[PDB]
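Fill-in record for Replication-associated protein.
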Amino acid sequence: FRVYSKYLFLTYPQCTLEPQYALDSLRTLLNKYEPLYIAAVRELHEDGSPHLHVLVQNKLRASITNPNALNLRMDTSPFSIFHPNIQAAKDCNQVRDYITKEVDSDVNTAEWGTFVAVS
């Protein structure tokens, strides 16, 4: 496992975290890279299961080699830990469309910051 990119696409499978609270926590977990923009959605699969997708655009190219670096724990019972798939976002515009339009969600998208126009 290795990622080295300003632009991260995270998916937490089977994850019930509120998008806003995951976003706020990722702002601190990724603070070494100076996050500039985050979007987070809860996708619902057709079986009802939730999957939390996050796009992070950082100012600095982020080296992530610890696959557990972005795990998050919920703050109420049963205090589950959620482990994400961490990938480079190859095309932030495509990933943002996936998160904010393509996936089915019945709750609001969480966003923070000014979207970066990537070269």
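KEY FINDING: The first helix runs from residue 19 to 29.
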